[PDB]
PDB file of C-alpha atoms in Angstrom:
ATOM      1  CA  UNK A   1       0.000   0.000   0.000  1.00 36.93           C
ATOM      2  CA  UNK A   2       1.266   3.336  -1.155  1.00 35.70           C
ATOM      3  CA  UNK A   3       0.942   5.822   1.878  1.00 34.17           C
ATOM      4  CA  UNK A   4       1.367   9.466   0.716  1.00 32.75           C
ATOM      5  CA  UNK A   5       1.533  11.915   3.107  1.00 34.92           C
ATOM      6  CA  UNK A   6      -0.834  13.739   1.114  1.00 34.56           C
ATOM      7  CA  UNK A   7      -4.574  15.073   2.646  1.00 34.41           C
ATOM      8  CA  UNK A   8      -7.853  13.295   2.021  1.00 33.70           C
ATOM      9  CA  UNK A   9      -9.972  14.456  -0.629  1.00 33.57           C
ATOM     10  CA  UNK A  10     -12.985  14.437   1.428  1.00 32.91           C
ATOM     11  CA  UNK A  11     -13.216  11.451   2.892  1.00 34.86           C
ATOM     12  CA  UNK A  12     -11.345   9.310   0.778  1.00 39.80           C
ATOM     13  CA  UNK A  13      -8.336   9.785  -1.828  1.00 37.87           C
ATOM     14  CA  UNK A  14      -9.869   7.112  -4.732  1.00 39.90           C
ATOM     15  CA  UNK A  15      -9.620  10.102  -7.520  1.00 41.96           C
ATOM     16  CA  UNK A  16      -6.500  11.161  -6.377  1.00 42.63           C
ATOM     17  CA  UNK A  17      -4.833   8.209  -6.385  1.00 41.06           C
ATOM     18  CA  UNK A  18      -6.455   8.001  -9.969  1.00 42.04           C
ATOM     19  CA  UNK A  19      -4.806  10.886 -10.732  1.00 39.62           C
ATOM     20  CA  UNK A  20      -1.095   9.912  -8.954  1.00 41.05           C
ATOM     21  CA  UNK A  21      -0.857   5.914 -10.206  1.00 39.95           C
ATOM     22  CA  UNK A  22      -4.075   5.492 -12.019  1.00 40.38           C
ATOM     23  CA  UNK A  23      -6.136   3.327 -10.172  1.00 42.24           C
ATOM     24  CA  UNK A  24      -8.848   4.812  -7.850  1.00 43.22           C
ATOM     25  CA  UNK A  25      -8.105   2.830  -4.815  1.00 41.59           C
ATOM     26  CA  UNK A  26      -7.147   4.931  -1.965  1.00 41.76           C
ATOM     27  CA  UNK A  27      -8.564   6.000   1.373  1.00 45.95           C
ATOM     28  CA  UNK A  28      -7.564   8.353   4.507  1.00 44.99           C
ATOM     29  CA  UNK A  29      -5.763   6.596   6.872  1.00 44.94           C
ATOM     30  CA  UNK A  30      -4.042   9.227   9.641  1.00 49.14           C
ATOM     31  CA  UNK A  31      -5.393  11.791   7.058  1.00 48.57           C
ATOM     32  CA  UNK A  32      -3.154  10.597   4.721  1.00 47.74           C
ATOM     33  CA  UNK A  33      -3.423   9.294   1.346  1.00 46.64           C
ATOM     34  CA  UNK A  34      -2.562   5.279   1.118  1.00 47.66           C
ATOM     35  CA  UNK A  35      -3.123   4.335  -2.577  1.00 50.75           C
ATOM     36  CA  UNK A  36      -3.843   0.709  -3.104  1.00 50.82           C
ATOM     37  CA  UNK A  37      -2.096  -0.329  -6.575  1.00 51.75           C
TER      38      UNK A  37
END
């Protein structure tokens, strides 16, 4: 799992992990940004 220390788009960070890697899997853990490639 790909934990950027990036903040949560709302609630979750599916479209910007889209937007980083591609796939929209992400969600805010710590308020961070863990991408799920």
């Amino acid at each position: 799992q790909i934990e950027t220390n990036k903040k949560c788009q709302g609630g979750s960070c599916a479209s910007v992990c889209r937007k980083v890697i591609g796939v929209a899997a992400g969600k805010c853990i710590n308020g961070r940004c863990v991408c799920y490639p």
